[PDB]
Amino acid sequence: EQCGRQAGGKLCPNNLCCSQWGWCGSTDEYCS
Ligand SMILES: CC(=O)N[C@@H]1[C@@H](O)[C@H](O[C@@H]2O[C@H](CO)[C@@H](O[C@@H]3O[C@H](CO)[C@@H](O)[C@H](O)[C@H]3NC(C)=O)[C@H](O)[C@H]2NC(C)=O)[C@@H](CO)O[C@H]1O
């Protein structure tokens, strides 16, 4: 994926959250 464990620990741009599955968001599905 793009971020988190399923990307090997990358983070997200500007200010957004990173989903439990590993993608960027800033919404609950992507902060939880
Ligand atoms: C309950 C569960 O975990 N079921 C498994 C599936 O989740 C898994 O596929 C993954 O699904 C998620 C959710 O649809 C995918 O995330 C989304 O991926 C798109 C890719 O275009 C991304 O743009 C979205 O932002 C992102 N959403 C979120 C909330 O992060 C994820 O990429 C899938 N990963 C993979 C490697 O397939 C399937 C396998 O396909 O298995 C289920 O057991």
Side-chain angles (χ1 to χ4, degrees):
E1 315 321 47
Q2 279 173 344
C3 69
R5 199 285 303 214
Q6 299 76 227
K10 265 62 63 183
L11 302 180
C12 285
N14 202 81
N15 69 262
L16 307 182
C17 297
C18 175
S19 72
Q20 70 309 105
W21 248 105
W23 301 96
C24 298
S26 195
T27 56
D28 179 30
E29 345 71 74
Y30 293 77
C31 299
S32 287

